[PDB]
Amino acid sequence: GSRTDLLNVCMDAKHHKTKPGPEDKLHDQCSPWKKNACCTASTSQELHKDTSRLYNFNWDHCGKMEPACKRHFIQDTCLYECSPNLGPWIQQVNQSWRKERFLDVPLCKEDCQRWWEDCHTSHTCKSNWHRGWDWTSGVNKCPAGALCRTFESYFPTPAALCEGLWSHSYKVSNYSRGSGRCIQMWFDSAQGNPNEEVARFYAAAMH
Ligand SMILES: *[C@@H]1O[C@H](CO)[C@@H](O)[C@H](O)[C@H]1NC(C)=O
Ligand SMILES: [K+]
């Protein structure tokens, strides 16, 4: 094989398409991926719906999450579901309907900082959202022992948030947005998808 085999691929998990392709009808925040996506239109619709049971996650576990904060979580979800440029960060986990996950996606420090700043006023009860919720109500709720606190209590720094939230799905890069060496969670599609060249950078040959 070749390192370029990790370019333009979709991870093997849950909703993902088998291979990347255009999706003219991606919804709202996911539309920047419309030219080449690993998500379907339906997935993009459902992830925007706070009460969806097709895409079930309760962002309002500690009262209503501020829109300025929630938008980042939606954006994170669009990148996760739709990106065809995260091949270099795929890791095998081999769970039911979830063969792969992401490991250490090098999120631009500016995207991490802004996410954290915008979520400073909001509340949560957990520093790792990937496991441990009480799901007996039908949606995730704060489990025993987990008190609602300011985001800053559970995530003292932006790195704590981006790296901790989904068990190291991101690793903060100190490169700048548009360096071509860190993944942007937020980008407009006007001038193409800037993460294509980022994947190519990390896929370049050894030595
Ligand atoms: C980013 O900068 C911080 C603060 O100096 C440092 O701790 C961390 O190792 C850096 N991360 C990189 C270079 O990926
Ligand atoms: K992308």
From Swiss-Prot:
Hey, what tissues is this thing expressed in? Expressed in placenta and hematopoietic cells. Expression is increased in malignant tissues.
Glycosylation sites (chain numbering): N94, N174
Report whether Protein biosynthesis shows up as a keyword of the record: no
Induction entry: Up-regulated by retinoic acid.
GO BP annotations listed: cell adhesion; folic acid transport; fusion of sperm to egg plasma membrane involved in single fertilization; inflammatory response; positive regulation of cell population proliferation; sperm-egg recognition
By sequence similarity, the record places it as follows: Belongs to the folate receptor family.
Recorded protein name is Folate receptor beta
